[PDB]
């Protein structure tokens, strides 16, 4: 009737009913003896793996019990971390070089999940003596592999990758500067007049200029068959009758893309007057600077091989395979990359597809995992100033002139 | 003249006229003796299956009669069931693990319809000792098949499937949070000016940017025939005359799909001034959270084999076949999946195409079936909080700048 979190289960030598015991059968069987027959509510018992955890009517003194008023057990939320203002690359540099706020928690998370050799040769602790390097568009953190090491495959170090930075702006903080143009090329222009000979102001005028471009592609496959029969008689004259038949099949696929730009002018002309108009279109390069204040999020990738003694993957492999997994440190995008979703749904055995967080809680403790995950998911705020640039965009100009009396 | 429900028919040793007796002839013949000649109104009689239920003029003392003021006999409506707030999966988990509100009524319905072995090996009652498991997108409820059983094909248990959950929102309860973007890629931009040299404010300006994409496909079949005749003479010179004729037929089918996005700006410019404008288009990923309060509905599927002694299918098979049927527990969608429609139309023999509810009423009683169906169709309400996510959507930005005096 109520969800049961397997970490907060106790034995006394509120009782758990049959439905709740069956909902988490695998975990309860896992943390039990080979022939350990225990007890439940309303006269039911459970047995060990020897009896394949059968739930049958019976009685005992060891009653698996659960809190009458349990706590949440969720990951706490901490206060935001502020980074000094600068460019995007500067903010990323300041973030990935922070030891106690970024390097230790991520290394501890990788160690808890079961990755091997998270650390450097000059230290004996997790997350110490690590090197930071800049890739094409991201950063890599890995232990320093200098000076020789002792251990099986100690030369294979786990790597941490950071990329795909995103910014959640404050609505009232965005500003931009002057817009400049270069490498301008004319497309088309138009000039005209609007004449009014009536006794009333008139507004019914319109001049419009439009410009379009498009592309397309296609592919086709064809198959065919043919049969023919010929008879020849040398009765000198010769007669040759031939009859043939053919069948064919075809398939096609395609697509296209279009871009359009339009401009219009609609003047209001005073009585007994005329007004001139003009419209122009160009192609040019556009640049401008900007500033804002935002929240920072990114992607986190862990690469290495999983330890033989124990890892947290739900199948628990024991052949030391190489592994890659990506987490999104920020707003939700999908179940596979969300730590909060997997942590919250750990009471449903059918939802466990990627990581086994009950195993981590059992190995290390609830409070330790809670604190580590709270430090990993801490929000980040900073002030950003940058530049915009693009090539071969559009630029227009629409003008309404001064009236001329008639 | 008035509908006759066969369950509330009585014999006294308001009479039923010939038309009403003929409207429900098959049921009345069914609940009668082999040579039981009974009586009707206005001098008519009916006979048993031996005489193929002929209705002919005559007289008797056993008069089949019907209430002068009958009751409805409809399924009652109960009060709503409230589930504690949470995510969609949490609400589904709380719904499918409720014993007295969900598991017993559905099992009893499956038992009444004629399905076999609805229950577990550790109990002798219907709907007890059942197991709940989570599938890819639904839930399965089935009896626990452990410990051996006695009976013919007792190892084949009936399964109950729940899927396709839908929510009917309260209009004034929906809220959503901040919208965030990631993985942004530029499509096109445009900048421009709007100039006004007249003595009056002007509003006739327009700049528009549009973007389109499309796909298409096609298929073709062709057939053909051909005939030719040749004559050759070696009169050294040779003459070869040839005449040929051909016929062909072709057929084609195809389709396409298009998506378009457009943006426009139309500023109002003060007299003797100019205003700048800008339009941008991007592609990005979009996420935001939401909350609401709603009514919950779902689909119900029953899988098993029908009992040889008696089942409720309108043809009454006796070879123990495997059966699958789906009900929609909620608003009406079609006749085949609506319990209320089939229950209401049980007085028309020509409408009985799926289940024979008169048989269930005869076997178990009117009140029992009414109560069971009332418990099955009970409405459900809950509060829902979730997350939204999608990839490669559109994002735009339109700006009107500050005037510049000329």
HEC-encoded secondary structure of B99-116: HHHHHHHHHHHHHHHCEC
Dihedral Cα B194, B197, B202, B207, nearest 10 deg: -20
Say whether B133 and A350 touch across the interface (CB within 8 A): yes
Contact A131, A144 (CB under 8 A): yes
State in Å, rounded, how far the first CA of chain A is from the last one: 89
C-alpha to C-alpha distance for A21 and B115, rounded to whole angstroms: 28
B174-177 own/partner pairs: CB under 8 Å, 24+ apart: B174/B290, B174/B291, B174/B292, B175/B290, B175/B291, B175/B292, B176/B288, B176/B289, B176/B290, B176/B291, B176/B388, B177/B288, B177/B289, B177/B290
Establish how many alpha carbons lie within 13 A of residue B118's alpha carbon, considering only the half-sphere containing its beta carbon: 23
Calculate ∠ Cα A286-A287-A289, nearest 5°. Answer: 150
DSSP structure class, residue A123: -
Q: Which two tokens stand for residue B370?
A: 């009414």
Interface test with B, best of A394, A402, A404 (most B CBs within 10 A): A394
List, in order, residues 6 or more apart from B145 with CB less than 8 Å away: B120, B121, B155, B157
Interface test with B, best of A17, A282, A400, A405 (most B CBs within 10 A): A400
One-character DSSP codes across A14-65: -B--HHHHHHTHHHHHHTS-TT--EE-SSSEEE--GGGTT-EEE---S-EEE
| Chain B residue at shortest CA distance from A298 | B182
Say whether A238 and B223 touch across the interface (CB within 8 A): no
Contact A130, A144 (CB under 8 A): yes
Q: Give B398's strand partners.
A: B279
Q: Which two tokens stand for residue A286?
A: 């556009």
- Helix ranges (H only) for B196-323 are none
C-alpha to C-alpha distance for A384 and A167, rounded to whole angstroms: 9
C-alpha to C-alpha distance for A3 and B89, rounded to whole angstroms: 12
List, in order, residues 6 or more apart from B226 with CB less than 8 Å away: A228, A242, A243, A244, A245, A246, B244, B245, B246
Q: Which approach determined this entry?
A: cryo-EM
C-alpha to C-alpha distance for A218 and B215, rounded to whole angstroms: 10
List, in order, residues 6 or more apart from B259 with CB less than 8 Å away: B212, B213, B214
SS3 for A338?
coil
| Chain B residue at shortest CA distance from A201 | B200
User: Out of A1, A237, A333, whose CB is closest to B233?
Assistant: A237
Task: Measure A281 CA to nearest chain B CA, in Å.
Answer: 9
Q: Give B190's strand partners.
A: A394, B279
State the residue for tokens 């949440």.
A72
Dihedral Cα B381, B382, B386, B391, nearest 10 deg: -10
Q: Among residues A82, A96, A86, which one has the least CA distance to residue A292?
A: A86
C-alpha to C-alpha distance for B356 and B376, rounded to whole angstroms: 18
DSSP structure class, residue A337: G
Q: Among residues A155, A403, A369, A164, which one has the least CA distance to residue A267?
A: A403
Report how far Cα A249 is from the mean position of its chain's Cα atoms: 43
Question: What kind and span of H or E run contains A142?
Answer: strand A139-143
Phi-psi sector, B88: left (phi>0), alpha (psi -120 to 50), beta: alpha
Q: What share of chain A is helix, strand, coil (3-state, %, to 5)?
A: 20, 45, 35
Q: Which two tokens stand for residue A159?
A: 């790597």
C-alpha to C-alpha distance for A99 and A123, rounded to whole angstroms: 15
Say whether A241 and B220 touch across the interface (CB within 8 A): no
Question: Would strands A180-196 and A207-233 be described as parallel, antiparallel, or unpaired?
Answer: unpaired
C-alpha to C-alpha distance for A88 and A90, rounded to whole angstroms: 5
- Name every chain B residue with its beta carbon within 8 A of the beta carbon of A334: 389
- Name every chain B residue with its beta carbon within 8 A of the beta carbon of A206: 204
Task: Measure B215 CA to nearest chain A CA, in Å.
Answer: 4
Q: Which two tokens stand for residue A175?
A: 């500003």
Contact A393, A286 (CB under 8 A): yes
User: Out of A166, A228, A265, whose CB is closest to B205?
Assistant: A265
| Chain B residue at shortest CA distance from A45 | B122
Tell me, in Å, the resolution of the deposited structure: 2.3
User: Out of A242, A248, A334, whose CB is closest to B389?
Assistant: A334
Q: Which two tokens stand for residue A82?
A: 């502020």
Q: Give B202's strand partners.
A: B269
CA–CA distances in Å: residue B81 to residues A387, B102, B376, B382: 57, 11, 12, 9
């Amino acid at each position: 009737a109520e969800p049961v979190y397997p970490d907060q289960l106790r034995l006394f030598s509120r009782p758990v009913n049959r439905e709740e015991a069956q909902s988490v059968k695998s975990n309860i069987v896992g943390m039990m003896g080979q022939w350990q027959i225990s007890g439940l509510a309303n006269g039911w018992v459970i047995m060990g793996p020897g009896y394949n955890g059968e739930i049958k009517p019976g009685t005992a003194s060891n009653t698996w019990c659960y809190p009458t008023n349990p706590v949440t057990g969720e990951i706490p939320t901490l206060s935001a971390l502020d980074i000094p203002d600068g460019d995007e690359v500067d903010v990323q540099w300041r973030l990935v070089h922070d030891s106690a706020n970024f390097i230790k928690p991520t290394s501890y998370l990788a160690h808890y999940l079961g990755y091997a050799w998270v650390g450097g040769n000059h230290s004996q602790y997790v997350g110490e003596d690590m090197d930071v390097t800049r890739d094409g568009d991201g950063w890599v953190i890995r232990g320093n592999n200098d000076g020789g090491c002792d251990g099986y495959r100690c030369g294979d170090k786990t790597a941490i990758k950071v990329s795909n930075f995103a910014y959640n702006l404050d609505p009232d903080s965005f500003k931009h500067g002057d817009v400049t143009q270069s490498d301008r090329q004319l497309v088309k222009t138009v000039v005209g007049w609007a004449v009014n000979d009536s006794d009333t102001p008139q507004s019914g005028y319109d001049v419009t200029l439009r410009y379009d471009t498009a592309t397309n592609w296609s592919k086709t496959n064809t198959y065919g068959l043919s049969e023919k029969v010929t008879t020849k008689n040398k009765f000198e004259t010769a007669l040759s009758i031939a009859i043939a038949a053919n069948q064919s099949w075809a398939s096609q696929n395609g697509g296209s893309t279009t871009t359009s730009l339009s401009q219009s002018v609609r003047p209001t002309v005073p009585a007994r007057s005329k007004i001139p108009v003009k419209i122009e279109l160009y192609k040019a390069d556009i640049s401008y600077p900007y500033e804002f204040k935002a929240d920072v999020s990114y992607d986190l990738t862990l690469s290495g091989f999983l330890r033989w003694g124990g890892n947290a993957w739900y199948t628990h492999p024991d052949n030391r395979p190489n592994w890659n997994h990506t987490f999104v440190i920020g707003p939700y995008k999908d179940k596979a990359s969300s730590i909060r979703y997997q942590w919250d749904k750990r009471y449903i055995p059918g939802e466990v597809k990627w990581w086994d967080w009950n195993w981590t809680i059992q190995q290390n403790g609830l409070s330790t995992m809670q604190n580590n995950l709270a430090r990993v998911l801490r929000p980040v705020r900073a002030g950003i100033t940058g530049d915009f640039s693009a090539e071969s965009q559009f630029a227009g100009n629409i003008e309404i002139g001064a009236p001329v009396p008639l």
